Symmetry: D2
Subunit: 330 residues, 4 copies
C-alpha cells in the first residue's frame, strides 16, 4: 500500500489517550462546549455521545473537517458509551431544556430519568473521570449524578453559577468601563431564579463598591445595581426569547471549568457542590459557592462572609432546591 | 456616581479600534466565524450585522456574556452598518444557504441581490477594509463584491477552496496516520463539484505520493485516491444531510484566513481571487489558487505548475463560473 | 529569477506596521520581554535597539531563527532609532542595574543620563507610541521619561508594582493553596523598598483576609503575613544573589502590560503613574496605583480606599520618591 | 489559622510533567517556551549549580500569575524529576566559537553516564529528548545507557536546522516560513543534508522551476541557504556568545507534538539501522512521526544517489566515533 511505501512503522500502535474529554449531548450547548474546548487545546481526544444518529455523525464530521486548524488529533462519536472510554473529563449536557416561561426546576423529572441511563454508562467506561454537569437544574442534577455515579463528591461538579458570575462581571464592567477580568463579584446559590448577588464582595482592585455606595444592590440605590442581578437572573430567558436558546456563553463557562480541571489550576469558581454543614444547612443540598477546582475536582470550599441578608437569601435558595430535591426518586 | 467615586478619568479617549472585524450574517456560519475569531484573539472589536433584529441581538448578548473568558473588549451589533465603521476586515456570510441536495450555484441570484444592499453599506463605513466573502457561490460572489465595492482586487477575497483543501488534508491524514498539518495537498478552482485536486503536489515531508504511486488519483489507482477528492466535493452535502448545515470547519477555516490577514502573516492559502492572466484565462474570473495573504489582502499568487489535464479542468471550472457572471443582474 | 517563476506579484504597496512593538535594551530583561511578547502574539513587527552591535545582531538573529514557531513576521534591529518607526508601544529596558546591597535609587543619575539620549530618539519616530519604562528606579524614570518626552501622562507608564503584586499573589497563593489568579492583593507605591502592601484589599473570592484577622500584616499577626511583603521587597535581591540578575518574572510582567495596551483590554494593573491630587500628594510624583490600561495607555486611575496606616505608608513612599526627583537635573 | 477561617478543606501527583535538565541559556529557553505554550502541569528543573538553579526556579515562580503551569520545582537531586512524561536534556559542554560540536563528545558522554541513569530511575517510562551536542551521538549514548526502546529516545536533531532553512527560504521568497517547505536531514552539524528535491511552496517543487537548485551550477546559489543553515550557530555564538531562543522554541515544538500526541512529522534524530541503507546502531535526522510514545514511524524520503551517499557519509563518521566510546 502507498502508506507503507511512504512510512515504515517502527512501533505497534497501542494508542490510549492521556487527556481525553467527552461531551455528552450534541445540542447547541454541547457543541459550544466542544468547540470551546477544542480551541483551548485541552484534550488529545474528544468524544461525542448522543441519541440522534445522523445529527451526532454530522457534528463529529464537521469538527473533524477543521482538524488542520486544531491540536486535538482524534475526534470520535457514537450512540455507544464505549466510545467515551478512558475519559479524564465527561461533560453532561443532554436532556430537556426550558421553554420560554419555564423554570429550570421543571426539567428535573425528565433529566433525572435521562441521568439514570447516562451516568452509569459514563462511569462504566471512564473510572478516572471528573463529571461536569451542565444540564438543568444543574445543582439538583449534580446531586443526582453524585448519588448515581458512586464517585466521591469532589469528582462531581455542577457548572453552577460560573456563568451567572461571568454575566454579572460583564454587566459590572460595562457600567464601570473596566474589563470583566478586573471587575470582581460573586453570584452564588441556585443557577436559576434564586441566585444571590454577594454585594459585599463586589470590588475593583480590592475597593468595595458597597463601601462607596452603602445602598448598593437595594431598591434605595440611585443607580439601581440590583437591575444588574435581575439581568443576570433574566439573561437565559432574555436570550432564549431572542435567539431560541443560549450556547456561546455557557460553552465558554464550561471550557473555563474544564481548563482548571485539566490543567490542575486550583482557581476558585462558583460551582455546584454539597453545602451541608455551612450557613446552617443540614441536608445534602448542592448549590454554587466559591470552590477550588483542580485535577481531583473540588478540593476545597471558600467560606464567604455574607451579610445577614445575603446569608438569608442563600439559605432561601438552598430551601427552594431542597423543596424540589427531597421529592426525587431514582 | 459610583463610577466617579471609584475611578478618576484622565482623558476622553480616541475610541477608534485598531483591529476591528465585522461579521455580516449571524446564521450558523457567521457565528462559527465569530466564535472562532473570538477564541483566536484576533480583534479588539467584533461587530455583527444582520436583518433579523431579535436573532442578531440574541447572538450578540450571548457572545458578550462570555467576555470574562475572552480578550475582545467590545462586541456590538446592529442592522445598521454604521456599527461596522473602521473595520480592518469584513467577513460576509449573509444570504440564502444551501438546502439539502441544493447546489451552491442555485443561490446565485438571491445572493447577488443581497450583495447589492450589503456591499455598498460595508464600503461606506470601512472604505479601507479587506472584504472576505464566505457566502456561496463564493467564487462568483467575490467577483460581485469586487465589482460593486470598487476596491482593488487585492482587498476582495473569497474563502474559496481553503476549507476544501483542509478537508483533503484531514482525509489524507486519516489514511496515512499523520496529522493533517504534516500532510500537504491542494484543491484548486471552483469551490464546488468542479474543484481540482493537484495530485502532483500531494506530499508528506516533501515526498510526493505520485512519485511512489504514478497512478495516484487516476482510475487505475489501486487505492482509489480520487475518492478522497470525491469525499472533499461531497463533504458539505453529506454534512448538510446529517445536521442540516455546516458550521465548525468553515468557521475555523475563515478564522485561519482572518489570522493571516490581521497578523500580516503572508501564509499561502487556496482562496478565490482574480486570475485573469493565468492558465489562458482572459476574463475577469475569480477562483481559488494558492495566494499569499497578509495585511493588504492578496499581494501575490503562486503559479502552480499543472499537468495538461489539471489545467484543462481549471479553464473549464473557469467557464462553468464565467458563464454565469457574464449575465448577472446588477 | 526563481521567485518570479514561482510567484506573480500583484501589488506593490508600502508595508506600514499596524501593531509594532519596540524593545530598547537587549540585556536579559529586554530579551525576556521580547520572547514573552513574541510568544503572546502581540505584535506584527518587533524592533530591538541597543548600543552593542554584535550582541544586538546576535539576539535579533536568534529570535529570527525561531520564526517558524511564531506569528510575528518581521523582527528587526539597529543601533539607529529609525528602526523603531511607527511603534504603538516602546519598552525601555536599557540602563545600569543595581548590585547586591545597592538600592535601585542609586541608579538614578546613570539612567537619567542614558534616558536623555534614548527618550528623544524614541518619541521622534513613533507619534502613536505609549512609553513603557522598565529600567530602574522605574517610578523616577517614568517621571524622567515623561519630562523629557513631553508626552501626556496617559502615554508614559512604568512597569511599577505589576511584578511586586504578582509576587505577592504567588506567595499568598502558596500559603493558601490557591492559584495566584484567584488570590487578590495589591502592592503599591515604589517598586522598591518603600512599597506598600494593601492588607485591607487582600482577598479570595471577595472575602477580606483582614476582616478575618484584623491583625493581618502587623507585628501581632500570629502568622506574620508581613513577611510575605518582606519577601516581595527582598525578591530582586534574593534572585540577584542566586543567579546574578532577574529576567523571567519581569519579562512576563511587562508582556502582561503590553497585552493590555495592544489589545485595549482596560484591565487594572498596579503601574507607575502621576499621582498628584491623590492622598493629598501635591507634587508630580510617579508611583504605582491601580490603573486602567488600554490602547491609549493609562486612561483612568482607580482611587483605592486606604486605611490611615496604609495611606501614611503610601505618602512615605511618595516622599521618598519626591526627594529623589528633587535631585534631578534636566 | 487564617487559611482554615477562609477555606474548608475536603481533599488532602502531576499528569503532564516535564523535566528540563540543565539551566544554562538553552535549558531556560526551553523552560520559558514550554511554560508559555501551556504544555505541562508541573515543570521540574535539575542542574549541578545549586544557587543558579534555585534562582532560575524562583524567577520563573514569580511569573506564576501570568502562566498556567501551577507547580515549578527544582533540585540537584533527581528525585524531583519523578513521574515525568518528558525529560529534556540540555546539560553538558556547549559549542564554542570557531569549534565543531564534535569537540564536545567525550565530555558530554561522561556527563550522560551520570545523568541518564538518574533520569531513568525516577521516570522509567518517560520520553527522553536529547538537546546537548553532538546531538546525534548523545542520543545514541542516552539510548544505550537508559536501556529504553528506541521510540522513547529522541534527539532534537535537525528540527531547528530545517526551521532555519525555511526561515531563510521565506526571506528569499517573501512568504511565511510556515508556507515554505524543505528538509535538512542527517547530522546536526556541518554534514547535514538539504533535500532539494522536497523544497516547495504550495506543492510546487522549486527544483522543477530551477533544475540546478542546490548545485554549484545554480545561478541563484541556493546552496548558500544551506551554508547559512550550517553556519548559523557559529555566527550567533560569535555575535552573542551562544544560541538559546530558536532552539528553545524548536524544543517546545517537539514537546508539543509529544505531550499532545500530534503525530506531526519532524526532522529529528532516531535510530536509523535498517532504514536508508545504514547497517550500524546510528542516530541521525530523518522525518519522523512524533507523538505520546515518541517516534512511532519514519518517513522514507526518496533520496538522490548523492543525498543517499552523503547521508551514508554524514552517517559513517558517527559509528566510528560511537565504536570507540565505552559505558
Ligand atoms: C443542557 O442544556 C442547557 C444547559 C445550560 C444552558 C445555559 C443556560 C441555562 O442554564 O438555561 C443559561 O443560563 O444561559 C443552556 C442549555 O441549553 C440551551
Ligand atoms: C453562508 O452559508 C454558507 C457558506 C459557506 C459554507 C461552507 C460550505 C460550503 O462552502 O458549501 C462547506 O464547504 O461546508 C456553508 C454555508 O452555509 C451552511
Ligand atoms: C532594566 O533592568 C531591570 C529592570 C527591572 C528588573 C526587575 C527587578 C528589579 O527591579 O531589580 C526585579 O524586581 O526582579 C530587572 C532589571 O535588570 C535585571
Ligand atoms: C546544550 O547545548 C546546546 C544544544 C543545542 C544548541 C542549539 C544550537 C545547536 O544545535 O548547535 C543551534 O543550532 O543554535 C545550543 C546549545 O548550547 C548553547
Amino acid at each position: 500500500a502507498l502508506k507503507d511505501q511512504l512510512i515504515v512503522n517502527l512501533l505497534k500502535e497501542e494508542q490510549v489517550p492521556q487527556n481525553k474529554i467527552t461531551v455528552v449531548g450534541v445540542g447547541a450547548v454541547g457543541m459550544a462546549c466542544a468547540i470551546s474546548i477544542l480551541m483551548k487545546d485541552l484534550a488529545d481526544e474528544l468524544a461525542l455521545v448522543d441519541v440522534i444518529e445522523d445529527k451526532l455523525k454530522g457534528e463529529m464530521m464537521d469538527l473533524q473537517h477543521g482538524s488542520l486548524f486544531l491540536k486535538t488529533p482524534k475526534i470520535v462519536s457514537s450512540k455507544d458509551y464505549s466510545v467515551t472510554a478512558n475519559s479524564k473529563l465527561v461533560i453532561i449536557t443532554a436532556g430537556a431544556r426550558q421553554q420560554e416561561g419555564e423554570s429550570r426546576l421543571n426539567l428535573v423529572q425528565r433529566n433525572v430519568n435521562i441521568f439514570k441511563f447516562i451516568i452509569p454508562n459514563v462511569v462504566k467506561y471512564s473510572p478516572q473521570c471528573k463529571l461536569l454537569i451542565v444540564s438543568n437544574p444543574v445543582d439538583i442534577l449534580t446531586y443526582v449524578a453524585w448519588k448515581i455515579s458512586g464517585f466521591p463528591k469532589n469528582r462531581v461538579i455542577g457548572s453552577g453559577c460560573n456563568l451567572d458570575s461571568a454575566r454579572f462581571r460583564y454587566l459590572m464592567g460595562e457600567r464601570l468601563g473596566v474589563h470583566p477580568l478586573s471587575c470582581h463579584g460573586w453570584v452564588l446559590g441556585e443557577h436559576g431564579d434564586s441566585s444571590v448577588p454577594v454585594w459585599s464582595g463586589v470590588n475593583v482592585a480590592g475597593v468595595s463598591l458597597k463601601s462607596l455606595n452603602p445602598q448598593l444592590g437595594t431598591d434605595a440605590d440611585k443607580e439601581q445595581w440590583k437591575d444588574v442581578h435581575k439581568q443576570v437572573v433574566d439573561s437565559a430567558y432574555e436570550v432564549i426569547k431572542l435567539k431560541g436558546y443560549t450556547s456561546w456563553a455557557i460553552g465558554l463557562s464550561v471550557a473555563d471549568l474544564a481548563e482548571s480541571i485539566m490543567k490542575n489550576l486550583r482557581r476558585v469558581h462558583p460551582i455546584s457542590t454539597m453545602i451541608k454543614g455551612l450557613y446552617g444547612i443540614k441536608e445534602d443540598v448542592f448549590l454554587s459557592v466559591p470552590c477550588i477546582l483542580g485535577q481531583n475536582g473540588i478540593s476545597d470550599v471558600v467560606k464567604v462572609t455574607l451579610t445577614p441578608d445575603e446569608e438569608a437569601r442563600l439559605k432561601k435558595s438552598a430551601d427552594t432546591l431542597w423543596g424540589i430535591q427531597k421529592e426525587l426518586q431514582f
